[PDB]
Write an enzyme that holds these catalytic residues in place. Structure first.
Site, PDB file in Angstrom:
ATOM      1  N   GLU B  51      -9.779  -8.431   6.324  1.00  0.00           N
ATOM      2  CA  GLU B  51     -10.808  -8.198   7.316  1.00  0.00           C
ATOM      3  C   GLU B  51     -11.958  -7.384   6.737  1.00  0.00           C
ATOM      4  OE1 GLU B  51      -7.436  -7.955   8.569  1.00  0.00           O
ATOM      5  OE2 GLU B  51      -7.520  -9.029  10.429  1.00  0.00           O
TER       6      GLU B  51
HETATM    7  C1  LIG Z   1      -6.380 -11.849   8.678  1.00  0.00           C
HETATM    8  C2  LIG Z   1      -5.001 -11.587   8.270  1.00  0.00           C
HETATM    9  O1  LIG Z   1      -4.657 -10.245   8.557  1.00  0.00           O
HETATM   10  C3  LIG Z   1      -4.439  -9.830   9.847  1.00  0.00           C
HETATM   11  C4  LIG Z   1      -4.345 -10.644  10.962  1.00  0.00           C
HETATM   12  C5  LIG Z   1      -4.101 -10.086  12.199  1.00  0.00           C
HETATM   13  C6  LIG Z   1      -3.991  -8.715  12.329  1.00  0.00           C
HETATM   14  C7  LIG Z   1      -4.118  -7.856  11.226  1.00  0.00           C
HETATM   15  C8  LIG Z   1      -3.929  -6.376  11.463  1.00  0.00           C
HETATM   16  O2  LIG Z   1      -4.061  -5.568  10.505  1.00  0.00           O
HETATM   17  O3  LIG Z   1      -3.528  -6.019  12.614  1.00  0.00           O
HETATM   18  C9  LIG Z   1      -4.353  -8.433   9.968  1.00  0.00           C
HETATM   19  N1  LIG Z   1      -4.552  -7.667   8.835  1.00  0.00           N
END
Ligand SMILES: CCOc1cccc(C(=O)O)c1N
Ligand SMILES: CCOc1cccc(C(=O)O)c1N
Lengths: 284, 284
Positions: B51
């Site tokens: 992200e």
């Molecule tokens: C994009 C892949 O990573 C993720 C997806 C959904 C939630 C989180 C999180 O840290 O809650 C996440 N790091």
């Protein structure tokens, strides 16, 4: 707050693009002579770009020695990372040409400037060797197609590149490979192509090199120009434009020309634009 | 050379780690009010971290409004990105607590400092809802296993998280999922877990959210503590440590505790260390 004896400056170059947020990013780390290679590999994994490069003092008469890391392995040569490195180093010299030492030898670059900025560069790549892959049924199954338009051959210029031909751009965009099956293809990238004449489209997949799909595989551009000529799609020596990365939202334009005949290649030139996306400093 | 009317500063935080090059990186972009969301998404794709976050002026009484992007989509809440954002913003305030507005509401953080640096934070997550996934055979086939140790349930706290239990850490490390098959699981992440007592291991896979395997899925940590208690692996309210990302070389330690009973949850706390890996400026 530093977490080491040295911090390192870096720049992010979008290679094979003339506007930021297009092309293929590379992180170029300056003054990297203090970094152990295992740490370079961990930094490349941290950045999570297709490659990070590390600028070292030259040892064989060049301007710099460059080590090149994907998220998972070191490469002895790569096109987008060296294009970006040449553009980044171009900001710190007036020279028209730059000589970058690599594990494949010294790579010569010609820099193009406009209004005081380096906007593009051209390189002479190692002349590749090639042979039949000999794994056609396995590879076509992994890609989810029944045939290649041309013989499936694997080229070596440091990394290895396989070429699989698709009958239309729509068919190329429709590929949804089995990336787990592709992971049985070690130390190579799978480059799928379609197009006509001067203009070609490509997609590249390489679990071996740590990337589901790469946006601009510069060391595949030179071999593709050779491959297209060997298989009668272009004349030997015709320049081509290769647009890669469209489906993943990272359109990248690579220019390539191979001089000679298949059995007596004399030069393999690959060029592209690049632009600086960002600059920063890391804590170690 | 700027390529816009505004440049943006950013910091790279390794979330759920106390040393750089471990944990899960997030790029935190400051002063982001001028950026259209489509541009935020393109910047997240450029950084290629799990992200990137964008710090905006608050609209509902908090300290800031944070928008959160994976390489492919916006999320309404996420744990590692908000932990990293809170730590990054902690460098610019003396306050012990920070209130970060998100699409799931205002998330309260408590910051921990040592020697003048923010070293860790704890958040109160949205209380999740859950139901049976109802796609067990399909999911187990995609993961390459025959059964889950516990019922396969999907939890929602903004993103969605499915939990699949493995009988040993060795079995967890041996997973090699079919990521193309997992891409049929939309708007969710697949979290596979194994362990005992206070200490658990996790791996997370999410083609829907643009990542083959994520190193530290903070919004899955709270739901896992609930899931483990509902299925008798821990007592309700027992704190757990969840180690994620080991196999991909990004070990990340998440701490979680859920207070109450399944039908009357009162708080879901997730905390972790974080460290600054780098800082920089982008050209737009
Ligand atoms: C994009 C892949 O990573 C993720 C997806 C959904 C939630 C989180 C999180 O840290 O809650 C996440 N790091
Ligand atoms: C790691 C995935 O990407 C790559 C692999 C091999 C070569 C190149 C290149 O640019 O020549 C490349 N970008």
């Amino acid at each position: 707050v530093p977490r080491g004896s040295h911090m390192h400056n870096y720049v992010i170059i979008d290679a094979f693009a003339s506007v930021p947020l297009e092309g293929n990013p590379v992180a170029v780390f300056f003054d990297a002579d203090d970094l152990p290679p295992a740490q370079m590999q961990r930094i490349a994994r941290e950045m999570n770009l297709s490659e990070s490069t590390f600028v070292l003092k030259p040892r064989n008469g060049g301007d710099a020695l460059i080590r090149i890391f994907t998220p998972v392995n070191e490469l002895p040569f790569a096109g987008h990372p060296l294009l970006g490195t040449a553009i980044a180093l171009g900001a710190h010299t007036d020279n028209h040409r730059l000589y970058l030492e690599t594990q494949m030898g010294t790579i010569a670059f010609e820099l193009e400037r406009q209004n005081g900025s380096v906007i593009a560069a051209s390189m002479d790549q190692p002349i590749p060797t090639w042979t039949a892959l000999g794994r056609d049924a396995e590879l076509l199954k992994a890609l989810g197609i029944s045939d290649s338009t041309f013989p499936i051959e694997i080229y070596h210029n440091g990394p290895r590149h396989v070429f699989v031909g698709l009958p239309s751009i729509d068919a190329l965009s429709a590929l949804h490979p089995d990336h787990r099956a592709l992971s049985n293809f070690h130390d190579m990238a799978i480059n799928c192509f379609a197009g006509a004449g001067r203009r070609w489209r490509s997609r590249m997949f390489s679990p071996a090199y740590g990337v589901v799909e790469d946006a601009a595989t510069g060391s595949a551009a030179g071999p593709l120009a050779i491959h297209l000529a060997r298989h009668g799609q272009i004349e030997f020596g015709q320049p081509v434009e290769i647009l890669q990365g469209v489906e993943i939202g990272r359109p990248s334009l690579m220019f390539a020309k191979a001089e000679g005949r298949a059995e007596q290649l004399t030069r393999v030139e690959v060029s592209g634009n690049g632009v600086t996306f960002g600059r920063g400093t890391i804590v170690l």
